C-alpha cells in the first residue's frame, strides 16, 4: 500500500541524482525513506508536513507500521544486509527521552551525544560507529564536518547478495563512453528471464537473490540511456515483475563493487524537504529547550556484486547500465543505481 508512493520517491530521488553527471549512482530508497520517516516523529506541524509530503505522501500515518513491517520483513532474515541510522547530537542540549525510545523501538536506530566543538574528534566517533555497524565495509563515511553542526543523521547500507543461480569468470573491457576501461566480467550461457523492451529501448534482465530479493538490470541501447531513465515508471516495472518467461542468451554481467555517498540536505532540499534543515526548523520533539535544525544528513550505500541448436544473443553489460533491487515480498525498491565505471 506504501510501495507505489515509495517507488515514485525512488525515481524522483534517482532522477534528481542524474542531474547532480557521469558518476556511479547507488542508494537505498527504503533506507532514506525510513530514516526521515523516523525523523518525522520529533517534528511539529509545518516541519512534520514537509517530510511526509516530501516522501510522496490522504496519508494514514500508519506508514510507520508499514515501514516497521518492511523493516521487520528485512530484519535479521535471509540475506546479508547491513542497514542502520545514527543520530548524533551535541552534548548538553537537553534532549527529549520520549524521542530516543521510539527511534530504537520502531526503527532500531541509535542516538549518541558527541562534541561537535571538536570537529576532528566528532568525525572520528561518527565514522567509527558506522565502521562498527558495517564491520569494515564502509570506512570514513564522513569527509567534511561543518563547524556549526548541532544535529547529524547518518544512514548507511551495505549489500552482499546470494544468487539463486550460482553463476568461471574472466576479464573484459568496459566502454564508459563512445573511452574503454577494463574490468572483470562474469559470464554464463543458459536460460535467463531476459527480454528486450521497445518502450524503454533497453535490455531487461531479472535475476532473483537467495534472500527473497530480485535484481533488475536495464541495459540501454546504443545511445538511449537518457531515454531509459526518463521513461522508467512504477507501472512499467510491475509489468516486468509480473512477467514469467525464459529465453536462451549468453549473459555477460560485470563483477563490481560500487559505493555511493550523498549529502541528503542538498538532494532532498530540491525535493521539497527543507524545513528540518533551515534556520526556522521546528524539532520540538527532539529538544524543547532551544531551536534545533538538522545540520547534516548523509547517506552511504555500498554494493558488492560477485558469483555466489541456435546462436543466442550476447547480452554484454559492458557499458553503462541501470539496475534495481526489489524486495520480492513487499515489491519495494531496496536499491537503485547506475554503473558508469566499475573501476572507481
Amino acid at each position, epitope marked *: 500500500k506504501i510501495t507505489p508512493n515509495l517507488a515514485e520517491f525512488a525515481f524522483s530521488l534517482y532522477r534528481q541524482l542524474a542531474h547532480q553527471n557521469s558518476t556511479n549512482i547507488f542508494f537505498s530508497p527504503v533506507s532514506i525513506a525510513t530514516a526521515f520517516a523516523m525523523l518525522s516523529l520529533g517534528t511539529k506541524a509545518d516541519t512534520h508536513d514537509e517530510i511526509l509530503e516530501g516522501l510522496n505522501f490522504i496519508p494514514e500515518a500508519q506508514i510507520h507500521e508499514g515501514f516497521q513491517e518492511l523493516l521487520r520483513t528485512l530484519n535479521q532474515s535471509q540475506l546479508q544486509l547491513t542497514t542502520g541510522n545514527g543520530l548524533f547530537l551535541s552534548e548538553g542540549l537537553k534532549l527529549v527521552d520520549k524521542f530516543l525510545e521510539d527511534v530504537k523501538k520502531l526503527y532500531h536506530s541509535e542516538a549518541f551525544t558527541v562534541n561537535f566543538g571538536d570537529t576532528e574528534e566528532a568525525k572520528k566517533q561518527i565514522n567509527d560507529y558506522v565502521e562498527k555497524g558495517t564491520q569494515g565495509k564502509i570506512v570514513d563515511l564522513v569527509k567534511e564536518l561543518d563547524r556549526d553542526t548541532v544535529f547529524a543523521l547518518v544512514n548507511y547500507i551495505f549489500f552482499k547478495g546470494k544468487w539463486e543461480r550460482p553463476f568461471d569468470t574472466e576479464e573484459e573491457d568496459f566502454h564508459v563512453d563512445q573511452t574503454t576501461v577494463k574490468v572483470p566480467m562474469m*559470464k554464463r550461457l543458459g536460460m535467463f528471464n531476459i527480454q*528486450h*523492451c*521497445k518502450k524503454l529501448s533497453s535490455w531487461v534482465l531479472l535475476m532473483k537473490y537467495l534472500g527473497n530479493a530480485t535484481a533488475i538490470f536495464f541495459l540501454p541501447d546504443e545511445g538511449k540511456l537518457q531515454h531509459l531513465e526518463n521513461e522508467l515508471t512504477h507501472d512499467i516495472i510491475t509489468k516486468f515483475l509480473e512477467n514469467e518467461d525464459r*529465453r536462451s542468451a549468453s549473459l555477460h554481467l560485470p563483477k563490481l563493487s560500487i559505493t555511493g555517498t550523498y549529502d541528503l540536505k542538498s538532494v532532498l532540499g530540491q525535493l521539497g524537504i527543507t524545513k528540518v534543515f533551515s534556520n526556522g526548523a521546528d524539532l520540538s520533539g527532539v529538544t524543547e529547550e532551544a531551536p534545533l535544525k538538522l545540520s547534516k544528513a548523509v547517506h552511504k550505500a555500498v554494493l558488492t556484486i560477485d558469483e555466489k541448436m*541456435s*546462436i543466442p*544473443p*550476447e547480452v554484454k553489460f559492458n557499458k553503462p547500465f541501470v539496475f534495481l533491487m526489489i524486495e520480492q515480498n513487499t515489491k519495494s525498491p531496496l536499491f537503485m543505481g547506475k554503473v558508469v565505471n566499475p573501476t572507481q
Partner: antibody
Amino acid sequence: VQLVESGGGLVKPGGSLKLSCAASGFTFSSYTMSWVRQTPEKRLEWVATISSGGDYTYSPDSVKGRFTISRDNAKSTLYLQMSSLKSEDTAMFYCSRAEFITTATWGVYAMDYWGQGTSVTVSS
Amino acid sequence: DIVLTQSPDSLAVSLGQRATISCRASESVDNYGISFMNWFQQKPGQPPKLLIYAASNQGSGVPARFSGSGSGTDFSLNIHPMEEDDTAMYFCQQSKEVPWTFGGGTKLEIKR
C-alpha cells in the same frame, strides 16, 4: 565500416589455406563475425560464425572437421584456416559482421556489412 | 537442417510494376513472436547487402520501396515501383536454428 578479405589463391586438392579479414571503422571486439562462401553457381552457403570474444564457434557438419574460424581482437582481424580442401570447396569467400538487431522483445542475427571477398580455387 | 525453397527462380518485372518473391521454409522459423527470416540482395560482382531483417523490417538505409511480409513458414518480398537498380540476385536466409541456411536464389530482371 570496412571489411577486406585476403589469402585466397590456387591450391591443390588436400592442401591448406588461411584467409584473413581486416576490419575497420568499429569496435571489432564487440561484434559477432561470420564467413559465407558463394559457389561458382552463385549459391550462398554459410561457413562459420564466431562470437564477439571468440569463446563460441559455429559451423555446419559438412565443414566441422576441415574449417575452423578464429579471431584476433588485438589485431582486429578475422581468420579462417582451411585444411583438407576439396575441389567442391572452390568458391568466393566473404567475411561479414553479424549484428543482433532488436525488433520486439527479441531480435535476429543479420549480416549487415560484407566485404569484397577473396577468391579460392581448388584444382589439380 | 531447415531447407529454404524460393519461388520463382527468375522473374521479369516491368519498370514501375510489382515484384513478388516467395520463400518457403521446411520448418517453422518463428520464435518468441518474431520471425528469423532475412532477405539479401546481390548484384553481379558485388557482395550481398542486407535488405530485410525480421522478415518485415527495412535494413539500414533501405528505402520504403522494399517490403517484406510473411509468418511461420511462408514469407514474401515486395519491391514496389521497380527501378533500374534492382536487377540482382535475391536470397532469403533464416537464423532461427543452426545451421544458417540460404534460399536457392531468385534472379530478378527488368522487363523492357
